[PDB]
Amino acid sequence: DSYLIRSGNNFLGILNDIKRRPEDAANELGVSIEEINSIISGKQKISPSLIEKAVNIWPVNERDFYIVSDDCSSGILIMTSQDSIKSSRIMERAGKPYYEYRDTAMSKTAPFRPEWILELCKVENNDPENPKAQWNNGHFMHQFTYFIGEVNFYYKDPEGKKHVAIMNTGDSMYITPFTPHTFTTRDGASQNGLILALTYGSKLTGDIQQELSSLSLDCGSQYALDFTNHENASLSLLEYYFELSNLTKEKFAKRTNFSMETLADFFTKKKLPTFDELKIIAKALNVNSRDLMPNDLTESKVIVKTHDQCDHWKYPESGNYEFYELASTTALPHSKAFEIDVSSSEDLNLDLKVGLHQYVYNIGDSALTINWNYENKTYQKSLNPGDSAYIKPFVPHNFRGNGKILILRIGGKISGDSQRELSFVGRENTQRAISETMQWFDPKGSN
């Protein structure tokens, strides 16, 4: 029923945005005003017949009327090791069993696609060209990976040359979307190698992808700027925002009080604008220096990090956890992967809180408890070995017991531009910004 309230708020917002009153919707859609008001109030779900009428007269899409179902209303969603076994499926490559996939904790509200994947193909050497390795085409999802056992991680560099990483338990990696890769188990291993492939979408799924799909490939491909290195990224961003301004080079020079030659040094990669120069350039282009800056450095398309390279620290000061910093890339500043040693059993107090989507997997051999609070209610559930969990953003929680967990945090679609826009709109408006509850004007008047 809270689904219907959110669905009614969604329909009301659609009517506000196109400047249609409830009476206007009834007249233009050929339906009674009672049906329109019953949808707005959340009494009756909107029908497929009404949705199709709306697409026919208004610049709205069918997907605008279907909201996301909340499948984790208590704030944390747990999937058992037994349920993961039931979802098992074997995939063959070149006629022999190659992978076993198992689903882990996912939610309709989060972009996680975390896969338990056992490596069924064994190799006799660590040659990256070994023909036993069956390669994929690369895939759309970003992929973080945690290694368990004697796994070989095969991947290609941008030139197409094959590489392999000889991985062991606690190693981790990140691989950029559409980079081909495959995994095997080394011969002589006590058991088959296993990877926890924590794949996810970021800022190219859902609505944004649809906004691109309606563009021609020639136009759409021009959004992809040259970020192959830091200097190219600086010029690509400068050129893009210079084009956005619709200035001439002469007016641009006159506005910044830079010479035409100074500008020429920038656009030919001869000179790089200093921080002070970048701020003047940004003001002239009606943008922020933040908008002209690339990332601080250019990461490799594939990041490999062995466990011995992981920095660690106690958290919090009391020391209930030991955090291990797993593989990462500044190309995804909101993707945080941690290995956490849990050694605390004295209380139920909530010592962890973070504004990101969270996925958990019990990689130890002991059971752990998750305590959390959500909507004025406190919960406590067990996370056994092989169990996984999804945690909504900002939910205060802890982990209790003696064990080890894998955690991946991602920003989803909110972190970054969206979070910043919501902050500018104002904290007093966040509730209405998330879900509209009133018509955009009162016809009786404000007087």
Binding to Fe ion (CB under 5 A) within 123-152 occurs at: 143
Q: Do the annotations mark residue 181 as ligand-binding?
A: yes
| Residue nearer to Fe ion on the CB measure, 138 or 396 | 138
Residue 215 binds which entry of Fe ion, a copy of itself, none, CB below 5-8 Å type-dependent: a copy of itself
Q: Which option in Fe ion, a copy of itself, none does residue 31 bind, with CB closer than 5 to 8 A by kind?
A: none
Closest separation in Å from C-beta 106 to a copy of itself? 4
Any alpha helices (H) in 180-293, and if so which ranges?
A: 207-213, 217-221, 230-245, 249-256, 260-267, 275-284, 289-292
Nearer to a copy of itself, 43 or 93 (CB): 93
Residue 111 Ramachandran class (φ > 0 left, ψ -120 to 50 alpha, else beta): alpha
Q: What is the DSSP letter of 357?
A: E
Nearer to Fe ion, 25 or 197 (CB): 197
- Contact yes or no for 410/200 (Cβ under 8 A): yes
Judged by beta carbon, residue 143 or residue 320, the one nearer Fe ion is 143
Shortest Cβ distance from residue 393 to a copy of itself (Å)?
6
Least gap, CB of 212 to Fe ion (angstroms): 22
Give me Rg for the CA atoms of the chain. Answer: 26
- The tally of CA atoms less than 13 A away on the side-chain side of residue 301 is 16
**Which residue has tokens 């990090």?**
305
Integer angstrom CA distances of residue 282 from 224, 227, 263, 286: 21, 19, 13, 6
Report in angstroms how near the CB of residue 50 gets to Fe ion at its nearest: 26
Burial (CB < 10 A; 0-12, 13-18, 19+), residue 287, is middle
DSSP string, 263-276: HHHHHTTSS---HH
Q: How far is CA 291 from the centre of its chain?
A: 21
DSSP string, 60-77: --GGGG-PPP-S-TTSEE
Residues 185 and 152: beta-carbon distance below 8 Å: yes
Least distance to a copy of itself from the beta carbon of 268, Å? Answer: 18
Place of tokens 């908008």: 291
C-beta pairs of 241-247 under 8 Å, 24+ apart in sequence? 241/282, 241/285, 241/287, 241/291, 241/292, 242/285, 244/285, 244/287, 245/284, 245/285, 245/286, 247/284, 247/285
Q: Judge contact between 316 and 337, C-beta under 8 A.
A: no
> By C-alpha distance, which of 320, 297, 109, 81 is closest to 201?
109
Q: Least distance in Å: CB of 60 to Fe ion?
A: 19
In the complex, what is the shortest distance from the CB of residue 78 to a copy of itself, in angstroms, rounded to a whole number?
14
Taking the least distance from each CB to a copy of itself, the nearer of 24 and 35 is: 24
CA separation for the pair 13, 296 (Å, rounded)? 39
Does the annotation flag 139 for ligand binding?
yes
CB nearer a copy of itself, residue 247 or residue 367: 247
CB-nearer residue toward a copy of itself: 24 or 265: 24
Min dist CB 383 to a copy of itself, Å, is 18
Q: Toward Fe ion, which CB reaches closer, 169 or 298?
A: 169
Binding stretches for Fe ion (CB under 5 A): 143
Binding residues: 139, 181
- Residues in binding site for Fe cation: 139, 181
